[PDB]
Amino acid sequence: GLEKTVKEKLSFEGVGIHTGEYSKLIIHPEKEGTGIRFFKNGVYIPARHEFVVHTNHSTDLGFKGQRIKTVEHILSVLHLLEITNVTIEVIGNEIPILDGSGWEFYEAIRKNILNQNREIDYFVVEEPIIVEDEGRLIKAEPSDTLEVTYEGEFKNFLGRQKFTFVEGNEEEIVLARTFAFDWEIEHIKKVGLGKGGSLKNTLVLGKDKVYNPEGLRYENEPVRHKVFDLIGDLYLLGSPVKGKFYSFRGGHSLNVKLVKELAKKQ
Ligand X SMILES: CCCCCC/C=C/CCCCCCCC(=O)O
Ligand Y SMILES: C[As](C)(=O)[O-]
Is 225 annotated in some ligand binding site? yes
Select 187 or 265, whichever has its Cβ closest to Cl ion: 187
Is 79 annotated in some ligand binding site? no
Q: Per-residue x/- mask for its own copies, residues 183 to 212, rule CB under 8 A?
A: x-xx--xx-------x-------x--xxx-
What is residue 80's three-state secondary structure? Answer: helix
Under the binding rule (CB under 6 A), the answer on residue 157 touching ligand X is: no
Smallest distance from the beta carbon of 209 to its own copies, in angstroms?
Answer: 6
Neighbouring C-alpha atoms within 13 Å toward the C-beta of 190: 5
Is 54 annotated in some ligand binding site? no
Told to judge if 57 belongs to the known catalytic residues of this protein, a careful annotator would answer no
Smallest distance from the beta carbon of 212 to its own copies, in angstroms?
Answer: 8
Distance (Å, whole) CA 102 – CA 75: 9
Distance (Å, whole) CA 154 – CA 161: 8
Q: Where does the chain have alpha helices with state H?
A: 72-80, 103-110, 185-190, 221-234, 252-265
Distance (Å, whole) CA 4 – CA 10: 15
Residues recognised as catalytic: 252
| Binding site, annotated residues for Zn(2+) | 73, 225, 229
Q: Which residues of this chain interact with ligand X, rule CB under 6 A?
A: 17, 57, 178, 180, 182, 184-185, 188, 194, 197-199, 202, 204, 211
